[PDB]
């Protein structure tokens, strides 16, 4: 009578409680600084905020009953403590017997595990509160949040293939937009690193939050480029040219991505480099072949930021913003090229 989603959830959390297990309590008490009260405080605060926003209605979302909210919270708290256990049991420090006070006092990790847990609970019930509702309600930076998604996938083999697909999916929403927000902390991370964007070779072939974000951004872009390149029948050595233009846009004109979508910068490069090449392709061909990809939706080429505000079209954005800042680079290929991952 329950959906495959809700049934998997129900069977993941069976026999488990909204509290730390005695195995976790022992790991907490092993640490110099016991994290249990900080962890319970974060959960109570996230708990109150989730049910306050769930209960009250907004134009966007009508508010639902507290009784459904409390159940959704209890299931997410049960997921939280079970997943925290598997993560902590399996950290190399635990396995070498070394104190885990530093790991367990990172507030950002606990808040973003609780929020993914809530996203799992809400997706499984096909909640109308589509991501990123939960991270906006909880004041969680995509740039910091997206890193727990990979851990959760690794730390709970009970998750359905559909759930891992949803979690990979929202990971890809953050890497294509969301983390390129004017208010995102990737801009602060870039500033503390002299505004030096990592290159594909420096991450794919240093280490830190900016590097593994770019790591992840590059490999999403890599996968998406091969797919437009195969659907458009274009070359495989031109492919390395538009990647080098894409890397140039990310490294030397990072601002172009502010309040924008990575696809917008990926397709604009494809047209430029192809037109600079004999391998000319045009936007309708590019847009129709992209229209097939799963994240491709109307808004990404019929609504593009121009000034911050006015919004237009992919071609208006290409000509008004993209060709001035990228034409000088593209003309060189009518030179060094960047290594394409895999």
């Amino acid at each position: 009578e329950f959906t495959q989603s809700v049934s998997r959830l129900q069977s993941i959390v069976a026999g488990l409680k909204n509290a730390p297990s005695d195995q976790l309590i022992n790991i907490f008490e092993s640490c110099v600084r016991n994290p249990v009260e900080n962890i319970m405080k974060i959960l109570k605060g996230i708990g109150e905020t989730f049910c306050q926003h769930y209960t009250q209605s907004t134009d966007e979302q009508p508010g639902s009953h507290i009784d459904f909210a409390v159940n959704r919270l209890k299931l997410a708290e049960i997921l939280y403590y079970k997943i925290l256990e598997t993560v902590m049991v399996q950290e190399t420090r635990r396995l070498h017997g070394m104190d885990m006070s530093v790991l367990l006092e990172q507030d950002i990790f606990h808040r973003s595990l609780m929020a993914c847990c809530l996203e799992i609970v809400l997706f499984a019930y096909s909640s109308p509160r589509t991501f990123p509702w939960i991270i906006e309600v909880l004041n969680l930076q995509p740039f910091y949040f997206y890193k727990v998604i990979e851990v959760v996938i690794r730390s709970e083999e009970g998750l359905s293939r559909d759930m891992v697909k949803h979690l990979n999916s929202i990971e890809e929403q953050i890497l294509e937009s969301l983390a390129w927000s004017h208010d995102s902390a990737l801009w602060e991370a870039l500033q503390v690193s002299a505004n030096k964007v990592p290159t594909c070779e420096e991450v794919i072939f240093r280490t830190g939050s900016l590097a593994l974000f770019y790591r992840k951004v590059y490999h999403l872009a890599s996968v998406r480029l091969r797919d437009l390149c195969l659907k458009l029948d274009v070359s495989n050595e031109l492919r390395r040219k538009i990647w080098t233009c894409f890397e140039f846009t990310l490294v030397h004109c990072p601002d172009l991505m502010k309040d924008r979508h990575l696809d917008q910068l990926l397709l604009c490069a494809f047209y430029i480099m192809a037109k600079v090449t004999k391998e000319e392709r045009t936007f309708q061909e590019i847009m129709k072949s992209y229209r097939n990809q799963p994240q491709a939706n109307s808004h990404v080429y019929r609504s593009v930021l121009l000034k911050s505000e006015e919004r237009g079209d992919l071609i208006k954005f290409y000509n008004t913003i993209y060709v001035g800042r990228v034409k000088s680079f593209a003309l060189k290929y009518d030179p060094p090229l960047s290594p394409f991952p895999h």
Binding site: Y271, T282, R302, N319, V323
Partner: peptide, 10 residues
């Protein structure tokens, strides 16, 4: 110049 005069479908 590098550019396009192509419109798009609705």
């Amino acid at each position: 110049r590098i550019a396009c005069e192509e419109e798009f479908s609705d």
